[PDB]
Amino acid sequence: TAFFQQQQLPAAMADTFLEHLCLLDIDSEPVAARSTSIIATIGPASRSVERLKEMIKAGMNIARLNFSHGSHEYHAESIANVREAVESFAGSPLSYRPVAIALDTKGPGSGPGLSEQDVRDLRFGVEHGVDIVFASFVRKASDVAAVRAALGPEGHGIKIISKIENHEGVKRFDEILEVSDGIMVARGDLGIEIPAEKVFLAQKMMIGRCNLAGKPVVCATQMLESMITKPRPTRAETSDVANAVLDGADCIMLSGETAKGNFPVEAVKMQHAIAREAEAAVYHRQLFEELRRAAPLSRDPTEVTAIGAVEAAFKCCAAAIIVLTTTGRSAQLLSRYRPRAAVIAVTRSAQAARQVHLCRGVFPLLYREPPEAIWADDVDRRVQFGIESGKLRGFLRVGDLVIVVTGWRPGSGYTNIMRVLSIS
Amino acid sequence: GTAFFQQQQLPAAMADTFLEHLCLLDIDSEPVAARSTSIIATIGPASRSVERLKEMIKAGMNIARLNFSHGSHEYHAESIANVREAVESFAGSPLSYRPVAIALDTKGPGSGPGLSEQDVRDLRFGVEHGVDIVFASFVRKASDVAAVRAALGPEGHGIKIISKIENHEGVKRFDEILEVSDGIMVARGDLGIEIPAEKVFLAQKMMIGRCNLAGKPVVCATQMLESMITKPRPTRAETSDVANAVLDGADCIMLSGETAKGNFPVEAVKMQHAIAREAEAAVYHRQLFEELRRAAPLSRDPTEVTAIGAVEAAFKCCAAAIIVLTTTGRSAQLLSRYRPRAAVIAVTRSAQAARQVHLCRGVFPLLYREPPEAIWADDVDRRVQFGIESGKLRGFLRVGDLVIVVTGWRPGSGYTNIMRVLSIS
Amino acid sequence: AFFQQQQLPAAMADTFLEHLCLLDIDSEPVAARSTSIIATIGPASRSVERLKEMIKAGMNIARLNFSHGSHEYHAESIANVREAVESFAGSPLSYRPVAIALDTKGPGSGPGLSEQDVRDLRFGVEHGVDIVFASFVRKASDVAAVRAALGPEGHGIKIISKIENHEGVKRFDEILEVSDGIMVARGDLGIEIPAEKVFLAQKMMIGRCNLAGKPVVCATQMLESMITKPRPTRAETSDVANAVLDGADCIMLSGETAKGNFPVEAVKMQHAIAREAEAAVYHRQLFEELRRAAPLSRDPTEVTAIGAVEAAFKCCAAAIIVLTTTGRSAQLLSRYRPRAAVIAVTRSAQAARQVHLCRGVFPLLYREPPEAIWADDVDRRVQFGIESGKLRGFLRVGDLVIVVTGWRPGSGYTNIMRVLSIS
Amino acid sequence: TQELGTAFFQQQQLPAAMADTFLEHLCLLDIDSEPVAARSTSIIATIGPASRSVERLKEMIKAGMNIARLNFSHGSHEYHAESIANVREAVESFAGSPLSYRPVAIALDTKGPGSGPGLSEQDVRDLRFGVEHGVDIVFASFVRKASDVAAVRAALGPEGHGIKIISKIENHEGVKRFDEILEVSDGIMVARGDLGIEIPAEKVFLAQKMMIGRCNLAGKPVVCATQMLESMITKPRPTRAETSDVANAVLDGADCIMLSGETAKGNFPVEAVKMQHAIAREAEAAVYHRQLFEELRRAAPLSRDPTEVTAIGAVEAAFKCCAAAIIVLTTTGRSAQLLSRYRPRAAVIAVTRSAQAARQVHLCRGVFPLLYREPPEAIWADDVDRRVQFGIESGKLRGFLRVGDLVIVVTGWRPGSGYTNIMRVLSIS
Ligand SMILES: O=S(=O)(c1ccc(O)c(O)c1)N1CCN(S(=O)(=O)c2ccc(N3CCC3)c3nonc23)CC1
Ligand SMILES: O=S(=O)(c1ccc(O)c(O)c1)N1CCN(S(=O)(=O)c2ccc(N3CCC3)c3nonc23)CC1
Ligand SMILES: O=P(O)(O)OC[C@H]1O[C@](O)(COP(=O)(O)O)[C@@H](O)[C@@H]1O
Ligand SMILES: O=P(O)(O)OC[C@H]1O[C@](O)(COP(=O)(O)O)[C@@H](O)[C@@H]1O
Ligand SMILES: O=P(O)(O)OC[C@H]1O[C@](O)(COP(=O)(O)O)[C@@H](O)[C@@H]1O
Ligand SMILES: O=P(O)(O)OC[C@H]1O[C@](O)(COP(=O)(O)O)[C@@H](O)[C@@H]1O
Ligand SMILES: O=C([O-])C(=O)[O-]
Ligand SMILES: O=C([O-])C(=O)[O-]
Ligand SMILES: O=C([O-])C(=O)[O-]
Ligand SMILES: O=C([O-])C(=O)[O-]
Ligand SMILES: [K+]
Ligand SMILES: [K+]
Ligand SMILES: [Mg+2]
Ligand SMILES: [Mg+2]
Ligand SMILES: [Mg+2]
Ligand SMILES: [Mg+2]
């Protein structure tokens, strides 16, 4: 078939990484959906409702609100505009794309503990329902603990992504990652605190440790910087985006390219285009083998089902792995093994649907329908919802094979079943 | 969690290199898993007593070979009846019943091309008596397997044909023979006479490797515990040979003379069982599994896709077993190809499939006798519980263990597609 | 203490994932920078005093873009480069050779060699350029045309084919076979093929070049923001580091040094990043794969090359000193990407300049006249390498070095490898 | 290459050796791929009534005996001295043509401590006998700890400091205290007979494979010892299990294989030697060198010793060109031993003036000793070149080398042992 010369499949079947590089083809068109999420910073150039709709079409998955600048009234208005542009597509539930809201804090700024503004800003996040928090200048575990105690009673569900932007944060990394929900390689400040020529070492090390831990990792600053004023990026910029994906980053960020630049939609489209190409060029054979050898033995059925499903997906070239999820944990565990198959996550939790964008290859679907009396009937309708959406979005075709990860009883934490299905 | 697990060579199995694996092999690391390599015992004067056969089934005989090179049709029918009587004496407790296959080893073409007249009569005898396997002697080409298949007729279409490679031509035309055969037997006796004796190990290791790749059973035959015909204990070379046949990747090991005419037939079965358990625990699963997958091509067959997914899931949690419901034994055979450390408990209603799956390494067959339940999903769950209960009774499973359960979406063979992680209660 | 620096904990990891996890920002690179820097000479860099501070920063090859400028302008640039290079020839133990590369304008609309290109190639032969960056090579017949235009005298000039269009990428294997090396001309490539596909072309071409043992250059917009700003972007420092990690022998500045406000700063920056990236190379997998892909050879030079590289890894050799006439012996050692330096002691001034195209090869130009006793002349050249290495900080007393030599004079007779202790 | 001929790449299991996986390697094993290289695993033959005849010993040396074992459990000192004299007489009968002379080591296998701790009185007398008679190796029976090896070393005295001590592991304690024994011993013998009595018979293969692996890592010789071709005591042909056992001992990584009873008292002693030689050649060609070498390197620690550094460099160079042999000049045999540790397919040819080193290097797999008799040249470099040419001439005469082949020459920068540091690529003229 033509199939075995599309998503860099000749290069993916190579026996060595050197042979894999030699088999990379510019004419091998990526077919799979773009898995690395795009975080776009919302500013003057992008807070228009009609502009936000354009950005969602372009591939924006997470909207970032930089709390360094702007008032609470400004940020609440930006949030409302994002939600209005997101809900304008809720008329066709088979094509609706959830979009997460992330609050990027100001920072401690030469002081002990959480700054007074950060305490006020985190309460604002709780009161406005932010899905993610990018905690600025995390240096130790206590910093993470402070950002989490700040999310008061009503906000323990918000995902804290610790921003590493100084030498101390890099040295105390393992202790930070243990208590954080993910990490952001905040390259701008990092490139000021540590020598500029050492930042790539910090990026590659942190991405690798995050991949091992199964926790999301974000590449953040100056990725397409020249696109603030120019319609096209530099050769170094497209290389940087592609290399962040190849390193193993779950998310790529635009901050200024979308916040204040002349080409915000073009920067999103560009990051989408590069990410698709870079994801097809990932050497899955070594990546999966190493992921397995490093990942410890688990007696958790969710984790055991995850490798079994990822292995099964590789064996048959599964178009997608469709997993039902309440908290997103099942989808996150599948994501850790970096399958070439899309992780279609079907969920009834609008928050979980937005928060799974932090995990690479997870494509969230929000199930809006009324429940069936028979739980088994309800599970099959949600599985069919993922198939119907996948078909519509081009992820699946009739005749394809899919892996369907489900649980034996309702409620989260009981995933234990994996099925091989033929799309009808 | 589950403290003090220095047993079943787990430190050696977790090594990063094969050299490190060898260095971590421990004589004090006792094997805990059930013996996976089947034992073929040739039935003769020293072993056709019904009470002796009962002793050999307890010792671990899985397949009864009948050497049609000696004995009359009357003698072999009586041997078969004695075997079946000793096998069925344990059918009163179905949770502990062990199926035993009956294989017919032909005399051979001797000095003449094609099937000999006696072989055609002997193959008809096998069909009439209901043998499960046929060890076709002196297979040299694919047309020889076709001749044996034709002699079995229409009724003998379910009988498994294991081609015996015992000459130079059979070794050179191996790939064409394996394609049309159900499995291979490395008939080392005649092979050691046709080709130089110092070259037989190359033929054995090559054929076992190609069989492992193909997913078809391979038998290591002849003189494995030869000194046990007259002595109660084998030589150092003999125990090494049995252990090395298992390490090579052989699905089955054989006794022919040690059990047929010797003074210690039950002791030879017990010895082969003891060595096989030790050798199976010393298999370097890390490289074996990785190489098996890199060589196995991509598959759009749900049975084959579910097989790796289940084997990978079993390795991840150190699953005590992989319980699979099978009609023809194919689902269990596909799991077996990936050589999991977990036991492939294969529950089946087919008494022939139950006997024939002994040719596949690591497949512990169970014969489910109960008639079908009205609700299909309830019948499946009862068969799964039958595997758990048999598994518990036989010491394979304990409460708290994790098992992988391979099932299908509808009745009939060929629809295996589901894998589940269960906790033993 | 030794085991902590030059990313040695990360280099000893058993997996690439474990290698990434062991990368340390406090593990300072100790080795000399192996990836050569090609700096484009323009208005911002043709001053003799500026060229001297560009050689100190780490410029190894001076590029002359024949798209702009007259023959008189380029001859003056050449003279200024040679004047700045020869100003350091007073101390031969510290003298750094600098290659001169001519970048052709290109065929443009023309199917074969353009008239200007034939004139420019003759100019290069007459002026003694070491390298030629042939623009827009699409097939093997294009390389042949450039080779013919160089004539009989230009047979020693290295031809680096620039791949800058779709056809050049598809016909890559036939071009690499007839070329001395390849340049991933990212600028035009990013215009001919989609910008999001250029990294695939770069990584593929670098990989195939590493396998072939032929030099490969990463060329456009590496530190672009340094034309107007004193510091590069996070994407730019990442791009340079990733070009080195991909396996590129040379990194280029074209505009950052040619017309930008910070030409010396761009050279210093590329040097700083390359040292960090070279120490973070996963040598265990790189060497193992290089060996498994490299075919068996009955050539004693090639056989001695792996033997020496393997021996250098075994003892953590500070450097490998090789005596070369044409640079081929040093090039073959370079193919195996050793962590140890490749000190190439040559009497050929052209070979000394041209070996900058090979990663990890540090050229020393021996000038002294030949000794009466052949074995004594060899030992004096070996001692010349040791003395330059000690002076430049590559070697210390107590270190172990691998010494690659031959059994007789003349090129092509390399067959000996020795383990020496620095005294 | 390709221009060495198809017949070259379809022999010595070269298609199977070039496979990318061990499974692919097994699938490419060919019975018609004839071994061409010389047999590298040494054969230790036990000398008894069936083999102490001078003419019989000559037949066994031709068949492939490398080390003669003297079992001190049976026989008197007078009997063993006579056996030694007959061995030396049969060995020296071939010394007329030094380019084809094969050195043969003499090994003393002690009786053992039996039912008592420490060295038995007879063992002290027997060890003194060995020193007085000039034995090259001692197989110390029932070694259980490092202090046992020290006792045997002390009993050999000052003169017996050059005698190699191979500790026999034949009980549970010896297996558990293996690492401390191997550290103080020159090598190990997997004494399977007693081991199969002390530990369960079904566990002996685990002990064998573990000890061989640890010895390969340490670079110290390892011997597989009991019942290898047992049926050949009475029968002219061995069983399928026996030929498999010998082949598997070689594939495990054993430097030496032993005959004890098959050669000592059996009806077919020369036939058992010929059989062990035939199997070893086939098994050596079927060794998967790619994984073996890669793993050996990853486990071997970094070394600042030039002899060790030159050893990998030479072994790697030999694999790259399919070098016919690796000629090394050695005084103590250490240089050849270090090359042997990396298990090259290229036959290591060791040129030495020490007759004891020539005999003792049989303990190292792949080492083919040549005893150089010529007196020293005035010019040191000329003496080295003459010894290198002696290796080439013996190599050509014995069929190891042909004109056109590539060889690797490992030499040193000065006389005296411990100065190996040079590796050269030579073309055979
Ligand atoms: O040893 S290499 O440096 C190399 C080897 C030979 C060459 O010729 C060469 O040019 C480079 N190396 C590159 C990356 N791959 S990879 O398969 O793409 C990969 C595997 C594993 C990774 N983990 C697991 C989670 C991060 C990777 N993260 O980024 N990439 C990863 C492995 C081999
Ligand atoms: O390279 S070896 O010959 C070797 C030999 C001696 C050493 O001291 C050493 O360090 C390496 N070595 C043999 C054993 N395997 S193995 O792990 O046991 C294995 C893996 C894979 C196999 N497939 C996949 C299906 C058959 C094997 N089939 O039989 N065994 C198999 C590893 C490779
Ligand atoms: O019917 P529900 O409550 O949505 O659950 C369907 C199945 O998916 C799961 O909820 C997965 O949830 P989580 O990923 O959040 O752990 C299983 O526990 C459950 O059996
Ligand atoms: O035995 P039933 O009741 O027909 O149930 C079908 C079950 O067995 C299977 O038939 C497996 O059979 P095969 O392995 O012989 O193909 C599956 O479809 C399912 O697990
Ligand atoms: O690298 P090249 O061009 O093959 O030259 C290698 C040569 O180097 C030498 O060491 C130098 O010898 P000369 O300086 O006399 O040419 C020769 O022995 C060997 O042939
Ligand atoms: O293997 P050994 O005993 O350490 O020595 C290797 C020998 O090789 C040599 O080249 C030959 O020297 P000799 O003439 O003293 O034997 C020396 O470097 C060294 O004595
Ligand atoms: O916030 C950021 O992205 C930073 O500091 O680089
Ligand atoms: O059955 C046979 O002939 C054998 O095993 O050699
Ligand atoms: O010519 C070049 O180098 C380019 O276009 O990048
Ligand atoms: O002496 C021996 O060989 C033994 O005991 O095994
Ligand atoms: K901020
Ligand atoms: K140009
Ligand atoms: Mg910041
Ligand atoms: Mg037969
Ligand atoms: Mg151009
Ligand atoms: Mg003993």
Tab-separated table of N, CA and C and ligand atoms in Angstrom, chain B residues 137-138 164 166 190, ligand 14:
chain	number	residue	atom	x	y	z
B	137	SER	N	8.039	-39.767	10.192
B	137	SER	CA	9.452	-40.112	10.052
B	137	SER	C	10.006	-39.792	8.685
B	138	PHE	N	11.277	-39.337	8.657
B	138	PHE	CA	12.092	-39.012	7.477
B	138	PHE	C	11.401	-38.132	6.448
B	164	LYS	N	9.551	-35.070	11.255
B	164	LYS	CA	10.826	-35.426	11.852
B	164	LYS	C	11.914	-35.176	10.850
B	166	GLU	N	15.520	-35.913	9.955
B	166	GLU	CA	16.555	-36.854	10.359
B	166	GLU	C	17.597	-37.147	9.294
B	190	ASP	N	18.872	-40.499	14.065
B	190	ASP	CA	19.149	-40.705	12.646
B	190	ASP	C	19.914	-39.535	12.066
E	14	MG	MG	13.681	-42.225	12.439
